[model samples]
Target chain A: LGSEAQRERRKRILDATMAIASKGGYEAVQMRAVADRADVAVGTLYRYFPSKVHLLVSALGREFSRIDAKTDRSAVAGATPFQRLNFMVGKLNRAMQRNPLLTEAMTRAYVFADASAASEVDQVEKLIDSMFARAMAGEPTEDQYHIARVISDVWLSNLLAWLTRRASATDVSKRLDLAVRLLIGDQD
Target chain B: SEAQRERRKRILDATMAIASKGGYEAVQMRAVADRADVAVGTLYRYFPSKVHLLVSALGREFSRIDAKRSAVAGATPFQRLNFMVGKLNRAMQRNPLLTEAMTRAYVFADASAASEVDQVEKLIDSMFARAMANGEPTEDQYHIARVISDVWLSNLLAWLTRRASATDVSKRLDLAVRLLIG
Candidate 1:
């Protein structure tokens, strides 16, 4: 296939995958349905994605790439570093809020990945880390790095609580706020 | 029937026995069936696959654990949470292989393992909830419990995989509880 043709085909597959995921979370984005949505043959779809997990994960990566393109790294909110950090988190949570079904599908695929999906999963994870890491300006100290890691870990971990219906929207944010305040001292 | 129950118990027992010995990968279908004294095909009838079978055993194990607990040591939510954090650490450390296997099975489970996964998660959630409040909890206390338990799984996986030191699991969770409960 031509390079331009390949790029167009890949975009169609990912866009169709996201459309299906938005309609129904993880389980509903079947291979055949995605093929139909993209109007590609079944054999062509499999060539791109060996399984639904791979398809969903690649789509998730594309979503993050779109987010990264829109972010103005220099213009992060807040006066102090901690304020900017929390604002970045608020933005992340707000993005998920707008498309919860798509959010659920993408989040579930990222979390439930196996060893075989390591490269794909790692790409998505690194994107998320960079998203948070960018909230701070200049070089981060060792302690600052740990705080970012812990805060991000808790937010994603707590995302599971909300996803599984064990916690509510306020419940998710309240705990997240506590994690940040504790890790960074909430000082202006 | 006692017959059915005993066979199921034996299957689970054999699964854990294998899990405790060699972790997740070692507990194969034929091996589990052989240990439990059921035919290999028979095992398939009940448990669809290795992940499903192991996930079920984890649920049964949680049930047994839940049965033994009475009350946490601390009167305040903070103290009680700390108590459980240490308790979970010790239990997990003692059964490192089994814990590793069962936890791997837990996170690896897919849509097919829904029923078993739900039981395990519920069991874990309730244990944390009780530690926070001896009686029923307020939404505030309950939310805190959920958040910490979420962290617990993340840290335990880190320890099992050696991404983080084993010694740090409880300490990290203790930090979380203090910040949260205070």
Candidate 2:
């Protein structure tokens, strides 16, 4: 297959993944069914994504990349770092909420990912941190990048905690708001 | 000591011993039972699942360390926090297998393990808060400690799984403490 065709096939697999995951939750996302739904053989699907975790994280990271591509990093309207982040956080949270069942599958997969899935998980984190960095410190300094990375860490933990019932959505936002304020001092 | 207490202590000791060899995957419930010299059923009575068992082992480790450890010396919050983060970083890295056994369960534990997991969270927050503060910390310092504690869990998981570079864990925690406190 050509490069563009390869992308469409991968895209089709991801589409089918969310379509099933949107209703059935994490356990419902069987690889065999995904292959059937995406119209490829089960053997071929494994060729593309070796395991369920890889498939879910791959799909989830693409969503983040989409948001990364479509929005203007400067399009958001906020002066302070926390304010800018609230805009970013609200945007991402809403995207997550829009398909929460799908979100659950992805979140669990990401959190439980072990050494085997480290490469893609690293990819996902990089895509996520890049946006967080751009949002909070438009042109980040070395210090700002460090601050941004840790804030992103806080952000992911909040998501996992909220998804897994250790915390509420309200606490997720509040904790993140606190993190942003303390780390960057809500600076100009 | 009561026989039940002895049995529970035996299991945790076996857990630390086995995990000391090869980390999280090595500490199977059956192996723990055999090593502790208790039946597997008795072990289950104390810690109904592997998650509970391993997490309790972590709680035991934390409680034991809580007794003897003191904060590193430094003049300001930044200096003290910096040294504390580095010390723990090396501390965990030195015993990576045991560290993984404790932390993997802590992070991956489900709702069934919620109560015990909450205790571990409390333990981590209290440890970080006291380690960075000379006496009782204010609300701000406590918040800083909680945030850093959360980062420590995730950062360590990344390093354990090779999701982070060797320096990434140290660099990230150092930044987290400095940014929040300084």
Candidate 3:
């Protein structure tokens, strides 16, 4: 397939993936089923989306773009940096909750797969970077910004652990609050 | 020493020697039996399988730490926590190869065998609980505790594979603790 056809094919494959993923967890996703669901030949599916990780991560990239479009970035423009961060965190957390399995698979791929050929990984990095910049708009020092990155990474990873039932809600809540209080030096 | 104890210890020692020298994949039943001076059948009688042998070897390895056993008679909870994390770091450093295997084995260990693994988990949980109860840590010590455990476990494998360093491990611990207590 050429450019437009290829784009359509990739869309079909991704839609089928989400449909299957929403219905069944990661374990239930298979190449043959994905092909059948997308109404394409198995070989064509692979040609369009080489691996399960690539397909699902691309799907997540699409969803992330949707989130970026849907979110009102200027919603907390007049609020403090901490308030903006809280809004951002709440938004991402809701996104994670809505697509737990898809998020799990995407994050796993994020960790396991190398980023050499993946421009989407760079896009994610840029997104998080700007998100931090937005969060750190009125911050005191870069130390606080660095702290925010680590805390956010842990938050993202902890969501994976939580999905696997390896993490607890109390723990995430405590960490988020402490991250803000310590870095921002703002007390309730 | 008890006869059964001697037999089990010898077998496990054989397994550890093989794993430490040749890594997880290199440790085989026949090789363990050969090193233990027991028949393969006798080895199976005690360990049941290579998985059992590996798990027991890890347990045997961990039992050498008397710090957790004796406890610091007068040390602060902060000092004790530091010591414990340091202890795990050093253990992971020394047996880099076998450490990787055991790390993988720890995750792969089934529910039936998770009792001993759960002991490690509980010890970690208590480590944080004591830190918090004693007011030795900031409010988020509990989250730091759980996250540090995962980071430590993952870091051990990363260090063994040369993906991370001892310095990296120490930095992570320091940074993670600072994040917790800050």
Candidate 4:
């Protein structure tokens, strides 16, 4: 296939996969179905992603990178550490609100990705958590990084509440605000 | 009308007994029917599936315990929240597995169950608003409330595994509330 054609075909497959994922959970977004929807053969789709897990990991990375790119790091330039942490969570919550289905896709994909992909994306999440941890605790402790990682993962665990429209924006904001605050304050 | 409701109640009581005795997995339709002296078809007529049965069962259990909790609500609002949650902890301790399965299911349930899952949130919000209006909860206490609730629920599930204790639950919840209000 031509390079431009391949790129266009890949984009179509991703879009279709996301559409199927939105209706049901991960199982609904099958390779054969995606290939059909995208007008590409199943083998062609596998060329882009060798396995279903690979496809999911790629999808999660796309979602995470999109959020990271869209984040305005300058908003908390003059804010306190706590405020900065709160701002980060509020910003993330807004992102989830705007793309609730993306939250589902991202969460499931992240959990089911292979070790290598998980670790790669996990490092990025660790960095974000460390920032929040520093802000909440005034400085990082020996295990602060791990704690931050856990807290960040807590959001993914909590995201199920948001994805299904079970939690309103205000409820999510409060949960994150409280969760991070306690996690920060409880730090040594 | 009253007899019909009573029959439904009997079916539920049978389900709860099966669950309480054999743990959550034992409360299948066959077991419920056997326990309640009803047919499997009759049981299915009451609850189309196991999940619906469990959710309604938990709701029923929540209602009864909540009634007992409110009996002391002629007292302080803060005291009431404490009493209510304290009673919940005790109830969980009594039927730990049932509580764990239901609560874990509450959090980790699929998208289809979201609407049904929100009953707890509404109940919590009402309690929170009352606590706020009673002047015990100050403005900007969202962080405290959310963390405590998350920790409370998370820790409770862990406790169900027998990894924690009622004393621990009480202490943590108390600290969490103090941190929120004070």
**What C-alpha lDDT, on a 0 to 100 scale, does residue A84 get in candidate 1?**
77
When sorted by lDDT, best at the front, the candidate numbers are 2, 1, 3, 4
- What's the residue-level lDDT of B52 in candidate 3? 66
Candidate 3 vs candidate 4: the DockQ winner is: 3
**lDDT (10s digit) by residue, model 2, range A1-188:** 45887788899899999888998988988999899999977887898888889899998899999988887655556467666766777778778868778998998788768788888897888787777777777576777677767877788777766666777788788888888777766475
Q: Lowest summed lDDT over 10 consecutive residues: which window, candidate 3 chain B?
A: B64-73
Give candidate 1 regions above 4 Å deviation.
A72-78, A139-143, B1-152, B155-182
For model 4 the local lDDT of residue B9 reads 88
Listed in order, the DockQ scores are: 0.16, 0.49, 0.16, 0.13
Error of 3 at A65 (Å): 3.3
Worst 10 residues of 1 chain A by lDDT: A137-146
lDDT of 4 by residue, B62-122 (tens): 6665454335546664566566567667877876657755664565555555555556544
Scored against the true structure, residue B22 in model 2 reaches a CA lDDT of 88
Model 3, docking class: incorrect
Q: Whose TM-score is greatest here?
A: 2
lDDT, candidate 3, A140-182, per-residue tens: 3555555555556556545654565554666555556555655
Give lDDT: candidate 4, residue B134.
48
| Error at B37, model 4, angstroms | 4.4
Question: Which residue pairs in candidate 4 have backbone atoms (N, alpha carbon, C) closer than 3 angstroms, thus clashing?
Answer: A178-B143
Model 4 docking category? incorrect
